[PDB]
Amino acid sequence: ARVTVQDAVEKIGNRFDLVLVAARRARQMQVGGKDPLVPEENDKTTVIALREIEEGLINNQILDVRERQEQQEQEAAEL
Amino acid sequence: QDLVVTEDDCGTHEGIMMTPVIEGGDVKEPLRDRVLGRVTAEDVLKPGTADILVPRNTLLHEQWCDLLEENSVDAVKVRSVVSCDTDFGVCAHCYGRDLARGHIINKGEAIGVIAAQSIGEPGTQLTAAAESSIQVKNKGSIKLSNVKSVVNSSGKLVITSRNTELKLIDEFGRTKESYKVPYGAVLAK
Amino acid sequence: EIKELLKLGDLPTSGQIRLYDGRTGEQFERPVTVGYMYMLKLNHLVDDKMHARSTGSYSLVTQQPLGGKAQFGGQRFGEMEVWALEAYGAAYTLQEMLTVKSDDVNGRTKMYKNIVDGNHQMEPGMPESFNVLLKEIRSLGINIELEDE
Amino acid sequence: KPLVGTGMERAVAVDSGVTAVAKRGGVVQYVDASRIVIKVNEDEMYPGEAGIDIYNLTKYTRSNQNTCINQMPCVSLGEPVERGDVLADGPSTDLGELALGQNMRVAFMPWNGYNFEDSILVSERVVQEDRFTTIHIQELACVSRDTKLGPEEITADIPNVGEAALSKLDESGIVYIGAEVTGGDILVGKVTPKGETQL
Amino acid sequence: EEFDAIKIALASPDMIRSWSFGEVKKPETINYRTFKPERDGLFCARIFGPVKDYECLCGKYKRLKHRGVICEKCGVEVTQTKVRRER
Amino acid sequence: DIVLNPLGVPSRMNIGQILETHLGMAAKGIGDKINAMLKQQQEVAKLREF
Amino acid sequence: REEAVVWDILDEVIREHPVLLNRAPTLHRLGIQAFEPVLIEGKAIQLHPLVCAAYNADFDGDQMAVHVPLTLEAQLEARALMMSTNNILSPANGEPIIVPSQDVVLGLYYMTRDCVNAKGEGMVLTGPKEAERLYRSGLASLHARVKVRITEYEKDANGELVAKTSLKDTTVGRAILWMIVPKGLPYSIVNQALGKKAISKMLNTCYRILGLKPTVIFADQIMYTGFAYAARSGASVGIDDMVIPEKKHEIISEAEAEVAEIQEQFQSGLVTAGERYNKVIDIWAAANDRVSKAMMDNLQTETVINRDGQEEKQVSFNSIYMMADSGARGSAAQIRQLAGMRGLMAKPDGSI
Amino acid sequence: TEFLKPRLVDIEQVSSTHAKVTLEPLERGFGHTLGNALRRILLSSMPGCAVTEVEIDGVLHEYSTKEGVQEDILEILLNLKGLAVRVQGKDEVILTLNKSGIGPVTAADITHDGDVEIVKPQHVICHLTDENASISMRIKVQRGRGYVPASTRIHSEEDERPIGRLLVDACYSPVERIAYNVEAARVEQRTDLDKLVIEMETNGTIDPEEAIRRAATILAEQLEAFVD
Amino acid sequence: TEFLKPRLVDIEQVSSTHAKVTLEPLERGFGHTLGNALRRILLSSMPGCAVTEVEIDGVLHEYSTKEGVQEDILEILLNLKGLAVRVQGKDEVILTLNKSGIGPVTAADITHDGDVEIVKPQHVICHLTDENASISMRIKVQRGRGYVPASTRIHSEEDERPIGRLLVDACYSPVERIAYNVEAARVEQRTDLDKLVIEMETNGTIDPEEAIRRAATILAEQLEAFVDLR
Amino acid sequence: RQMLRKATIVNAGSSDFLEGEQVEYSRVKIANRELEANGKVGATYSRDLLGITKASLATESFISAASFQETTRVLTEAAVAGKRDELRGLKENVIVGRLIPAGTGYAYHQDRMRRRAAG
Ligand SMILES: Nc1nc2c(ncn2[C@@H]2O[C@H](COP(=O)(O)OP(=O)(O)OP(=O)(O)O)[C@@H](O)[C@H]2O)c(=O)[nH]1
Ligand SMILES: [Mg+2]
């Protein structure tokens, strides 16, 4: 969260993987301009990803599943 | 530098038997605090061998440790880094708790560096000889392990062993105080 | 002799006084030692010591930033400081400090452009100090090659 | 001066040489914020040369650590003085005694962590009274060299420069005496001959 | 470039020749007057590369247009000055 | 003027600063008496006595 | 040009952006920590007291390196792994390093410590709020021994917290500190006179029962209350603070005629240089301990406090004694050479 | 004079009892000037009602024990200190509490009385153990201000004092806690400028927002003697 | 509310600088409430007049030395900080000081301007050694409040930089010292009723009486904001 | 554990052990696991203690050995052996300015090791 990131560690577990997953999500919002699931409330992309992980919306597996979905939609469009 | 947590569980039963540092009467370092946050090896129950109390690879939390003290367990084989089978690193279970986090160590943590730093720091930062008579603090019976002494014309037991360990046993039969007797000593009893 | 002198001043022999807090007006709950200490302002003024750097000139051979405030220098990230990042997790912070922040010439300009572009992406490379090391070992007549994937 | 001293204070101030001390003594003929002229007494005054000592005082000069060296006159106009009396005080000297800093009303007691580990809590009154206000004189040089392309010019005529900047430089390209300056202001204008003009 | 490993081995006389772009015959560094690199000296531009980006020594070829164009007259390759750190 | 921390004395074992402070106040005590007598003019005889 | 709009933009960038602070020497990993920066006017870096332990930071001119983690990844590794809050326990031993001292511990000690009767001994209050109101009203000392009604919250077998109300025999000050204490903890934690040693245990206990955010808030609260009551008190040093044992010269003159008798016996014939060296060192070493013990028995206690009628003995509120007993700064050893006897000094050879 | 006035900005009302009040912008030093001045009035000068005297039948002094009652008389009195009372018209009212049987005696068992209003009728006073036990008392509520203890009441008032009348502390003040925090209000230009955060905590007889208004009013009433 | 207002009772004026002010009757606790609140405004907020700019002819900067003058320009400026000035009408007045010959230059040598009043005419500014020496300067006195150092004033406006003006500190604040004592006012019935004794020590300018009136005014102005807006 | 890294070997297995070669314990255990399943010549071993300085120079990364101490000697012995450093350790990766094989980098580094199996 804002202050401390303990809760988001408790969702995923490995501090190291927490950082990778929060990084990947923050990159989506930074570059892709992906819309945040929680109200922004003037928060940086680093903190928003941690909010989304805390509440259990963002996760390595979930991100991978939606990557496949958008990627398959684009394959559909190209063919 | 190379030592990193590579595996979660090597599934080895090996364990460094750690005893309570009881040197100089007052227990210097308790066994509870010496095995606090370390994976246990071998289903070690209570005195009465008929029902398992503790399992195998199980993180010793402050709660488990408090149970250990009611039963007064003296010796515990615990899983250690040295006896870990993992090739090219060590297992989260052989190590135990990341003392800085207060829970089981995360795989990928650079343990060796932390070890070297933590041994090195105190040294770098840190940069009464009236021991004549042993007087015993609590009543009990004299236990002399490793001792070969000769009786002198006084009536008294004059020790002639080099390694001499006087211990203070209670009633139930636990070791509670230690006292390094030297060579050339007169024992009262 | 000091207490005798204090009595001549009609000041207390203890040299402790009743003090009142300027903020609240209430008294402090016990007597406080007050008097005159001769104090010195040493040459170490903060004005002279504060220094900060984002990007600057870079060293001739090693291509790392210079040292010292007079040369507009980056702070030295020493072995000791590196080990701290090793103990933690922090692998990206470390690589940053090794590469786009020091030698990596292409990397530092590319990442500067990314930070103004607001990309906050590293794109690492090869530290020029290492390229030098290779050249210095080949100058000794030792073949040191990079073996490819 | 130091209120709680030892007595070495005066010895050090005199022997350091930074104080002007009277060799001959006699009565002071003329004080000035620059000079002291003393008329010598007949008993030490030799009958050969004119018996008037002149001590020129050093005014506000740079030290090696860029601190300030200033001599002020101690005595008043028409004061009788003996041999070995202090005529002018050096930089960190009171009437003859050595004065390295400033004594202050101090109280030993915690504040709201504003004196945590040796941290010091000071009154605004100290700043107001300009006690521990310190004077520093820095020396900057501008060198006109001769290069393979040709000699460098110290003109006020400098390519790509605001009138704001050139206002402070006079005809030759030198800043005026008394002029206040801040980082980036030009002190001595200098231009260097460039060979290749390829753009 | 991204590689797997690094190996170290004794340099063959012929291996050493491979890296070389010429034999420095003379101790001459630069000319005292035109502070430019001397013939087949220690700072020879003909061997180590051009002093200035995409510019030969005698100055006949300039600008990024001329790329790898070894000037016939002085014998200096028109590439970046960076090369003189690697050759 | 200045508020210094008591805890930076007994560990440091420089007790000189405290004696300097007590004497410093006594010195200034007598300066404050002379300042008071000079503000009220008073007698040269009385100043001389004190 | 440092235009006014630029400051507003800079404020916006620094928001939620962590910065690394480093102090030399970096002996262990806590020599680097991440913080969220707070823009301040002035040229000095402001460091949080409680982390000064990890850095071995004391403000007599130490400096620190600042480093900016640029990438999103580096920002996340700083916020999650390297943040001050997240590195509370040391990597070496389980004991934590983050713990206030000095003024902070001094203020807590003064309040917690209870004196004889004082203002309003043996009153009864409805909770810590009546206590606070009494103290601030000026009808009660912080050290008044009065019974108050406090409601502690003990955790049950599950996640639910059980509430328990009981009368406690503590002091006004400790009741008011209970207000800072989060629900879960026992009242017995604040009921002793608190020092730095007890407060470290308090924060560790709170961390293992309640968790991270509560201990973070609780740590801040302890710092604020500690400073606040630290300036409300105002203990200091003096010249009479250092008490000297009355029976010091009696133990000095005895020891001194004794050593004299052995020096006269030296010319006689019972003594080598080594034997007499040992005998004189033994005599002075025992004298030193004697004078130190008598000095510590005239300083620790030796408080004649007339209780509500007759005389009592209680612990001394002598300033230096409180500093030493609280563990705020000097130890008994430093007070041995302050008001006691300096002792036997050892030559550079190591011989005494 | 470039006078720089503050204005009441945010009123977080966490509860009817607890309410935080941020205040800006304040000039340097006015944070503590206004903070403390108000804190002192709000503690020692906010007026209110409180139990002064209690007379229980079959009780000669406060140290005895009544059978069928778990709490000693002292503990009962301490609960009556916490009894929240409003008197509308009169300055002094004597309320009667008669109750019997097994159960927690609450403040609702007090005989109403038209003008008097008991803010917390569920307030615990006594626990009755045996059903045959009955408790009867006459509780005197006076209006005053600040904190007037029995120790400061016996030393000043030495008039009528018969045995049996149990005197308890009377916390007239409706404000239970008050603390003010000065935080930096980084202001358009001034960094010296601060905000005042007053964290108030009453019982609910007086509104925090109204209590602050009253405290400032008392302060300005004292400044009428100094003309402007 | 049996409200109980104090009224200004006794004004002992020990000197033009020092003045004691007893105040009664005060209700219990209002002694310290008013005492400190007033002390803080009287130290930080008090309005006054003080020397802001000085321009001496033949003087480019404050570090030079003028011939025939014992004191360096810095020391002269520090003496002008201590110059006690009242401006009646205008906010900013420029006084002229021209003096020659041997003598201690006093404040009386300034051309007495009509509205402006120099409180201490004997105030020493300069010592002239040589008879041929003459000093001429134009001293600007501005009205403000608190403490405005030359360093805080060298980082704000500075629209024009006339090589020849010297900025010096000017303590606008007339109040040098203030302390308040709460004594018991053994009131007809109440013994907790108290008096407030304010010992003020100013330099020149502000009248003690007038200053207390102004400080109470500023506090009451600040309370209008809280009594009004909720 | 790092002190007890190396071990001397007696006899031969299916690899090149013979009398008294000093090889790391992990690598001889790997050999012994495949040997016990398949058979071949069994190899008796004996763990050796190395005190810190020598243990660090005995590491099979010469970039870590060189960076530590004795750089001239380390590089002659590596140059003559034609030794190949695959950059397994942390010091090795820090020198080339790469991601550490630990903490954050352990995820990425394990992905590269599986990229060695195919593509
Ligand atoms: N790293 C380093 N630290 C130094 C050096 N010289 C002094 N110090 C530190 O400077 C500090 C000076 O004393 P303190 O740190 O205040 O000592 P302390 O442990 O707080 O004990 P007290 O003085 O009794 O409060 C010590 O922590 C030293 O470690 C140096 O050369 N290197
Ligand atoms: Mg220290």
Ligand SMILES: [Zn+2]
């Ligand atoms: Zn050419």
